């Protein structure tokens, strides 16, 4: 028993193993071409850059989104690209995560104490707030159906202005919201709080991602980061 709409969003999900194998392959070749004479932060920028390519390809092929004109498509992705990265990170730790470890889009597992040594104070703070979201979502039994809904609520955001077809963005927001409310009610009838607890995470994810952008823009002006990641920071 699943609303037809949530099924339509599920069929648009990419094959996770193939997205991850591709990113892993790209990063292997890049390191092969480098002479011994790339910081860990630089590597993560490369990894997130490749993740943005697959996010664009996903959205491009997704229901509703593929009906928007290119200009409207660009405005939506420029407003939520960072939220989608952080949301995919969070869901990655929910499914595969382990305390003291961070699972990357490449399928690799890394120790928290290794990363926390290098990330710096600001990223450690943002990573910590994300982990607190992980633990919260894990105790709620965050599943894939609820995940794809939140992905579309992030993508089709009401904060996006100057759209030619704002009616569609508003319609998707409304119908995905109604389906999630129905899905949690039917499949978790004993969790009155689940719906609200899920939606209350979107503002938190927004804050983490907007602060992550501001930090990455700072790191770029510092000369610490030209690819898709840069283009999205400036736009």
């Amino acid at each position: 028993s699943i609303p037809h709409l949530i099924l339509e969003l599920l069929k648009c999900e990419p094959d996770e193993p193939q997205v991850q194998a591709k990113i892993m392959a790209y990063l292997q070749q890049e390191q092969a071409n480098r002479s011994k004479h790339l910081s860990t932060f630089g590597l993560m920028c490369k990894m997130a850059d490749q993740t943005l390519f697959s996010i664009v390809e996903w959205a491009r092929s997704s229901i509703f989104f593929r009906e928007l004109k290119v200009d409207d498509q660009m405005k939506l992705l420029q407003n939520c690209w960072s939220e989608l990265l952080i949301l995919d990170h969070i869901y990655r730790q929910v499914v595969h995560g382990k305390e003291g470890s961070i699972f990357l889009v490449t399928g690799q597992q890394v120790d928290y104490s290794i990363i926390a040594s290098q990330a710096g104070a600001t990223l450690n703070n943002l990573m910590s707030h994300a982990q607190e979201l992980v633990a919260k979502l894990r105790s709620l039994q965050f599943d894939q159906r609820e995940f794809v809904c939140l992905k579309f609520l992030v993508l089709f955001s009401l904060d996006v202005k100057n759209l030619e077809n704002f009616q569609l963005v508003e319609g998707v927001q409304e119908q995905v919201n109604a389906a999630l409310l129905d899905y949690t009610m039917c499949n978790y009838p004993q969790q009155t709080e689940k719906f609200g607890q899920l939606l209350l995470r979107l503002p938190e994810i927004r804050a983490i991602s907007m602060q992550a952008e501001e930090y990455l823009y700072y790191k770029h002006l510092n000369g610490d980061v030209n690819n898709l990641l840069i283009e999205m920071l400036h736009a």
Binding site: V56, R60, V70, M74, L77, L228, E231, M232, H234
Partner: peptide
């Protein structure tokens, strides 16, 4: 943002 428009249009 030329790169983003290209990724949305390319065949």
């Amino acid at each position: 943002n030329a790169l983003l428009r290209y990724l949305l249009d390319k065949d």
